[PDB]
Amino acid sequence: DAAKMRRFLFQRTETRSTKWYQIFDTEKLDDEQVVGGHLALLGVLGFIMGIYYISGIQVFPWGAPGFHDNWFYLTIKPRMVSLGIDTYSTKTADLEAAGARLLGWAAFHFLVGSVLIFGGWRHWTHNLTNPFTGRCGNFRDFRFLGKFGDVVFNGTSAKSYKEALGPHAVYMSLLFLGWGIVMWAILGFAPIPDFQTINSETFMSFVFAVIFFALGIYWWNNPPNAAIHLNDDMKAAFSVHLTAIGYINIALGCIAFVAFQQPSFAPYYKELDKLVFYLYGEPFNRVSFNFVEQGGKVISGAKEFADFPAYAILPKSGEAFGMARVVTNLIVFNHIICGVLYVFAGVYHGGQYLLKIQLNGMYNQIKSIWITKGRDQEVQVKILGTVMALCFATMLSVYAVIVWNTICELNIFGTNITMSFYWLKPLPIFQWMFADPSINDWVMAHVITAGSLFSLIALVRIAFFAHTSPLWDDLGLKKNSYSFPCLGPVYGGTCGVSIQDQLWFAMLWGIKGLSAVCWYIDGAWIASMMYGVPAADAKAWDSIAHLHHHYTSGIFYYFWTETVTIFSSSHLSTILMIGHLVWFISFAVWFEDRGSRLEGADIQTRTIRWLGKKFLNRDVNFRFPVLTISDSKLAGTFLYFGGTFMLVFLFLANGFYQTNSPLPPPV
Amino acid sequence: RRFLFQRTETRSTKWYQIFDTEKLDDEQVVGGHLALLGVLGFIMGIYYISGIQVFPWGAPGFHDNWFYLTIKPRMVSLGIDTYSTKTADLEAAGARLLGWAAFHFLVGSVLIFGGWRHWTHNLTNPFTGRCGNFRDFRFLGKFGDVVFNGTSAKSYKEALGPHAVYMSLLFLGWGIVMWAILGFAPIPDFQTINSETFMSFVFAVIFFALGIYWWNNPPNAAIHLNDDMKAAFSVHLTAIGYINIALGCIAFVAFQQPSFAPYYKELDKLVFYLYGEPFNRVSFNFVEQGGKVISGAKEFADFPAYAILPKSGEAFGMARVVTNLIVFNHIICGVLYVFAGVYHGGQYLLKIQLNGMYNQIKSIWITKGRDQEVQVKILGTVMALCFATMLSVYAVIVWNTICELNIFGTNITMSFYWLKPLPIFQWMFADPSINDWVMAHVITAGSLFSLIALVRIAFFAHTSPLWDDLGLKKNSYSFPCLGPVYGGTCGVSIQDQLWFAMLWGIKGLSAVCWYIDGAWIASMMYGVPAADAKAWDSIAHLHHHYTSGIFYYFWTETVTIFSSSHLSTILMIGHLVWFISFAVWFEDRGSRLEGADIQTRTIRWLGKKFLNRDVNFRFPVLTISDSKLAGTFLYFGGTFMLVFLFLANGFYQTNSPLPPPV
Amino acid sequence: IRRLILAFILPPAAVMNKEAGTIMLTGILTLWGWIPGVVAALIMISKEQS
Ligand code: G2O
Ligand SMILES: CCCCCCCCCCCCCCCC(=O)OC[C@H](COP(=O)(O)OC[C@@H](O)CO)OC(=O)CCCCCCCCCCCCCCC
Numbered sequence A: 001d002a003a004k005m006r007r008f009l010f011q012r013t014e015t016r017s018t019k020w021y022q023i024f025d026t027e028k029l030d031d032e033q034v035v036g037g038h039l040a041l042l043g044v045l046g047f048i049m050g051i052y053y054i055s056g057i058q059v060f061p062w063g064a065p066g067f068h069d070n071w072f073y074l075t076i077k078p079r080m081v082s083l084g085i086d087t088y089s090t091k092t093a094d095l096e097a098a099g100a101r102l103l104g105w106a107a108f109h110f111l112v113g114s115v116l117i118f119g120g121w122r123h124w125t126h127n128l129t130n131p132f133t134g135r136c137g138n139f140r141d142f143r144f145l146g147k148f149g150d151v152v153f154n155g156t157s158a159k160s161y162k163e164a165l166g167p168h169a170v171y172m173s174l175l176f177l178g179w180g181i182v183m184w185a186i187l188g189f190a191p192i193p194d195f196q197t198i199n200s201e202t203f204m205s206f207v208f209a210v211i212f213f214a215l216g217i218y219w220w221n222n223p224p225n226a227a228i229h230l231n232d233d234m235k236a237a238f239s240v241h242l243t244a245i246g247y248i249n250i251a252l253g254c255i256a257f258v259a260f261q262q263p264s265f266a267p268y269y270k271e272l273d274k275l276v277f278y279l280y281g282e283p284f285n286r287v288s289f290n291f292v293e294q295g296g297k298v299i300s301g302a303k304e305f306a307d308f309p310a311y312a313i314l315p316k317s318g319e320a321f322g323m324a325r326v327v328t329n330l331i332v333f334n335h336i337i338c339g340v341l342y343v344f345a346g347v348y349h350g351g352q353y354l355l356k357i358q359l360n361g362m363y364n365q366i367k368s369i370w371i372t373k374g375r376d377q378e379v380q381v382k383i384l385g386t387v388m389a390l391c392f393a394t395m396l397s398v399y400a401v402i403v404w405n406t407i408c409e410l411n412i413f414g415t416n417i418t419m420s421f422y423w424l425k426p427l428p429i430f431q432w433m434f435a436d437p438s439i440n441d442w443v444m445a446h447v448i449t450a451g452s453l454f455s456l457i458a459l460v461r462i463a464f465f466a467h468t469s470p471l472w473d474d475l476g477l478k479k480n481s482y483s484f485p486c487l488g489p490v491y492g493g494t495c496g497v498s499i500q501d502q503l504w505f506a507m508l509w510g511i512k513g514l515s516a517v518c519w520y521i522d523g524a525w526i527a528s529m530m531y532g533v534p535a536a537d538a539k540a541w542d543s544i545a546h547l548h549h550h551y552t553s554g555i556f557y558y559f560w561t562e563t564v565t566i567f568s569s570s571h572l573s574t575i576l577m578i579g580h581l582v583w584f585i586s587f588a589v590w591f592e593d594r595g596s597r598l599e600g601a602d603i604q605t606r607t608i609r610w611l612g613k614k615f616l617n618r619d620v621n622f623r624f625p626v627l628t629i630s631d632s633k634l635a636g637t638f639l640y641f642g643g644t645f646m647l648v649f650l651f652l653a654n655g656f657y658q659t660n661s662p663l664p665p666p667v
Numbered sequence B: 001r002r003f004l005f006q007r008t009e010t011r012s013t014k015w016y017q018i019f020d021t022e023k024l025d026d027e028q029v030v031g032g033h034l035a036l037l038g039v040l041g042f043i044m045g046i047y048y049i050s051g052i053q054v055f056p057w058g059a060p061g062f063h064d065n066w067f068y069l070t071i072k073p074r075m076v077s078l079g080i081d082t083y084s085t086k087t088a089d090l091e092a093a094g095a096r097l098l099g100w101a102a103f104h105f106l107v108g109s110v111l112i113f114g115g116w117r118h119w120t121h122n123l124t125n126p127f128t129g130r131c132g133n134f135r136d137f138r139f140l141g142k143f144g145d146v147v148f149n150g151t152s153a154k155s156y157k158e159a160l161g162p163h164a165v166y167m168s169l170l171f172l173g174w175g176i177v178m179w180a181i182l183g184f185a186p187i188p189d190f191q192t193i194n195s196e197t198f199m200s201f202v203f204a205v206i207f208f209a210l211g212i213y214w215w216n217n218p219p220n221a222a223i224h225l226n227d228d229m230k231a232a233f234s235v236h237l238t239a240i241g242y243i244n245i246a247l248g249c250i251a252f253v254a255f256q257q258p259s260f261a262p263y264y265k266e267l268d269k270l271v272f273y274l275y276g277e278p279f280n281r282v283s284f285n286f287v288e289q290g291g292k293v294i295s296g297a298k299e300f301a302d303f304p305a306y307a308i309l310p311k312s313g314e315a316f317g318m319a320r321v322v323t324n325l326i327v328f329n330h331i332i333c334g335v336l337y338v339f340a341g342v343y344h345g346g347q348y349l350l351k352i353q354l355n356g357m358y359n360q361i362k363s364i365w366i367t368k369g370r371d372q373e374v375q376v377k378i379l380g381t382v383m384a385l386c387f388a389t390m391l392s393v394y395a396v397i398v399w400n401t402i403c404e405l406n407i408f409g410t411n412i413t414m415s416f417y418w419l420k421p422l423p424i425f426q427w428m429f430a431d432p433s434i435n436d437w438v439m440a441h442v443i444t445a446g447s448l449f450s451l452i453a454l455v456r457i458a459f460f461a462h463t464s465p466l467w468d469d470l471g472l473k474k475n476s477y478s479f480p481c482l483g484p485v486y487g488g489t490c491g492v493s494i495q496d497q498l499w500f501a502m503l504w505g506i507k508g509l510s511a512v513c514w515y516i517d518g519a520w521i522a523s524m525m526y527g528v529p530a531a532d533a534k535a536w537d538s539i540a541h542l543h544h545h546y547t548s549g550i551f552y553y554f555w556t557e558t559v560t561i562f563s564s565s566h567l568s569t570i571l572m573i574g575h576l577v578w579f580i581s582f583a584v585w586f587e588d589r590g591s592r593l594e595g596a597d598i599q600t601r602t603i604r605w606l607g608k609k610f611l612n613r614d615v616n617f618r619f620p621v622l623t624i625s626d627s628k629l630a631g632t633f634l635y636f637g638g639t640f641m642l643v644f645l646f647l648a649n650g651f652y653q654t655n656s657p658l659p660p661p662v
Numbered sequence C: 001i002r003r004l005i006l007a008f009i010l011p012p013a014a015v016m017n018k019e020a021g022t023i024m025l026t027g028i029l030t031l032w033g034w035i036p037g038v039v040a041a042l043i044m045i046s047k048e049q050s
């Protein structure tokens, strides 16, 4: 009746809505519910760690062929060899012990995770009753553990988050000491301050246990004040800690990248190059079209090799396939992308809280420095403008250097590779942080700076212009939803001004500066777009710049080289197809086409209703829903970012192929 | 109420609308077409100049270029150029090319002069001093007395006829041009270029006899006469688009025929020195000087300095490369002209729906689709057929690739290797297979899929059943949206539907590119050594080895793009231009506007207390309409500057069906 | 003096007078190598005096 339809597209409208992906929004969660959710998720984390340990079994000591290699366990196998729970052992006898140890640790993780999940469930339901004693614990005022909960934290459980930092630090000191004693007792590894063995890990676990305990005492008796995070800790403290964890995670990725290449880490990562890996989905022993089983020996349709019966997964060496740095790059890039995403999400959730306090006037009611700074509307403009100017300068300089390098490679306009930026290396005072310092590393540093500033532009726009901007201050407008996609074509268009869309743009902009890491950690010569290509002079880089290594290929030729192995395997090929499929579908929701989709969905609804009557019968009242531009942007950011980083994984997991033999000039 | 229509109009004074039909009359259109044809003759002349290889006075000529290599088979067909390996014959070929280029310059100067002289409405003969009335004139003198007895065309429906006899005169004049200048007496032997002269005379007779009928019995289409600037232009533009698609198909079928072998197949028998191809690469310490090779000997002992290295026409199947270039150029131009004709027709349709004379139309071409329920049924059946065909063909492709890669333990014997076209359709193809069936169904799917947007343009130019039930109407044909209302109204104008039709036909046209390159669109992997993609030629019993699959098409046939500097530069520029379109297609215009105001305040802040004086300049941001226009051009150009690299890098579709790896 | 030593060591530390956004500029210039931050600190510490 034209109104029954109207309260159908008045159901996805980007007003304030339920938004199923916000059921666990911190606004409706209290402190104890957060504790319980984190405990349950840590229990599930223990469950999946046990699953990974099970996937690490190769002999099943009770007697059976084991699991094939997989990235889920290959990314942690060096750690388990470091802890002595797994082995790089060539013999079944020492591998049965590793299987037994992994099975026992998986069972232990299952038990501990079940306990942790049950505790988190009881915290989630506000049910801290001890079934053995029948009493009930008080979340607001509890003794921590007992006598230990009285000598330190003399009763008086923390009532505020700034008052909870200290007991948390003491809890983390307990964690460090517990891990140290677990090392010392279960895993051997007595604490020796020899910073070249795993014993140093136990020693530094005890050192950090002492440090964290003292710091927790100090912050228990002298709580610090960020002030504002105490009130809306659901979003303020949560987002600040999220961006802090993002920076910590980027730092951890850098630590992993530096450490896993050191000689002290050789028996755990570099020794992966002496192994042979049988990965799921890799090229299997193929057979002809007329295989008739009857094992022991093939009769009709001889397979590729007489060995590896039927459809066995073919071996691949760890030296040609650089599994050492493949695993290193997987771990490092995982933690780097997670850190970048956590920084972006912390800025976004902080902008959410900050718009919430700008809407109710609490923004002017903040006393802490962290907002009294940006409550200026000019220091906001100055900061964003100087970030944009620095991003413009760095990005323009580095991109023009890259384009000139590519021109000199291809000899466009009759140029030559000696006209390129082969001389532009890091300073000798900066050459210590690179191996084989060249224009590639200079370009990497400047591309990292440019991409970080490019994403920082949108991060600053989230931080400052959550509710209003100098443009929207000059106009008679204000932002009051953090998720509204637009106000319309007025002023030529107002698309994507909310902090959610600014988050999406920050993610898309950081895609470049983050994939630049994938090129780098794979050694892919981002200093030019066509490297190693035999066009004019791209193979002369190794001689003109006196390179010591030989990186894979330039930015564009990186999709030709090392894709020879993505295509060579079925699993990586189907991942490539799925990633590209997911990625381009984001155009259906980022392109300014939502109303076209709504109109076409109305047409399809009328068609299906009519097609359900001309041929079928009965009412066809079902109608096609269209994702609104808020939902369209959310789904599009997910589709785009996942589509690109399901294939950055393919670049990372297809091999290293960054040989240390600089090829001679073409001459 | 006539003011209201002018009041409620979007700004139509944009830089890409200065030559709009609504602000031109008949004679300015004549002048514009005449000047454009003069510049076109100038372009043909410079192409012929680029066709010289021996420079009749005696000198090395032009290196081969795609602009001239496209027309070289035709120029040889007319005898102006030759596939001769001796220098003396190329002397005459270059002399003929130079003479024809000079003739083109002269005729183009005359024709540009005429285009200017019509554009200014001053048709006065400079010698005898008389004038010429555009609305009433004698065509050529006694010719305009024997036919069109004193009078002239008062309307386009009365101009079809004189136009038809003008085209008959063009055919006849081309007949005498061939017969006299080029030899080629008109013989009804449809195996040589004599048949073209004979059919030129036949077409001259036919269009003359048809123009007489259309002058004596003018046709009745009515509505293309009143708002004749846009309605007739759009109808003729979509007609020319379909004609161009047909001509591309004609070229594809004909250029592989044995009769066209002396002009196209002989391209494989020559070596080509294309511009920007790998030259004689040189070492670092080269000094050339007078002794040539004093230090740092170059890549080849011959080919001094940086000479462009030869390229074989056999491995690089430039016969098929040139055929693909011409065919795909005409096909993409035809599809674009069809889309643009539907778009400009929707412009006229919204114009006549706004002013209320939509229901005053009597032609079936309007009344048939003026029901708002017949429109729904047509669009719904188009969407249903599109969904069915595309679901079937895409699931077939995905299943073929799954059976290739042996996902879920599947085997290539489970794929659609048996789904060839029916024998009554196998004459359409050489070596019919799943590739040809998938190609036909992909063409149907893409054509219907872009036809969805075309039909929405043709029907929902002013209102749609959804917008009827809402309190909304379309009145701009270029407006992007009505804001976040109803969850969003993005991209509902006919301009936006035209953009969607273009982006949707991008897939169905890349299908054409990959089929005419023999790139096995039947599956996403082929010739890749994963599980079974190299076993297609054996199980499917193929007589050809297609280049690769859909996804593997970017690895193979790119080894040659990379090996040349020019193709790599085109690749990089196309990718850059393509992804730049995201900055304007994404729902981000307001973000760009806010950031640009930040840029303005920064540039004026950095220029006031660090530089001096006002910095009044402010950064402009394309509006959503401008953003979508620029993004559609960036996307379409970025993809079809590299579809060119597909076409112009070799055929590599050898006839050796890759025995299975066992 | 003390402030020059602070600028050489921690250029943001010496420059706390100027602004809420200028201090980020000095800090990030210090992040890039160490010379840009020191140069900015000396430039804006000799600007209010000279
Ligand atoms: C994967 C590619 C795409 C489609 C598949 C598709 C399908 C589709 N689109 Mg689309 N689209 C883009 C991509 C795709 N758009 C892009 C990249 C842009 C940005 C330029 C874009 C833009 C617009 C605009 C502007 C409009 C639409 C529509 C419209 C609908 C038409 C309805 C119809 O006739 O049926 C046609 C529908 C089909 C043939 C679907 C059949 C399945 C098949 C087997 C493909 C499988 C789908 C997928 C690959 C697998 C995932 C499944 C999952 C389980 C893993 C129809 C659902 C329109 C409407 O919604 O209404 C008309 C509309 O207005 N779009
Ligand atoms: C008879 C008329 C025709 C009737 C039938 C026609 C309709 C049939 C259509 C069915 C299939 C539709 C074609 C596809 C439709 C299509 O391609 O358009 C995308 C589509 C949005 O479509 P709209 O809602 O605009 O319109 C589609 C309409 O057909 C009905 O909604 O959905 C998405 O945005 C997908 C994201 C869902 C959320 C997923 C987010 C990401 C999750 C994680 C996945 C990635 C992992 C991370 C990697 C980065």
Ligand code: SF4
Pocket: A485, A486, A487, A488, A489, A493, A494, A495, A496, A592, A593, A594, A629, B480, B481, B482, B483, B484, B488, B489, B490, B491, B587, B588, B589, B624
């Ligand atoms: S194009 Fe879409 S997102 Fe942008 S202003 Fe219009 S309705 Fe809003």
Ligand SMILES: [Ca+2]
Pocket: A329, A522, A651, A652, A653, A654, A655, A656, A657
């Ligand atoms: Ca890699």
Ligand SMILES: [Ca+2]
Pocket: B324, B516, B517, B646, B647, B648, B649, B650, B651
């Ligand atoms: Ca080709």
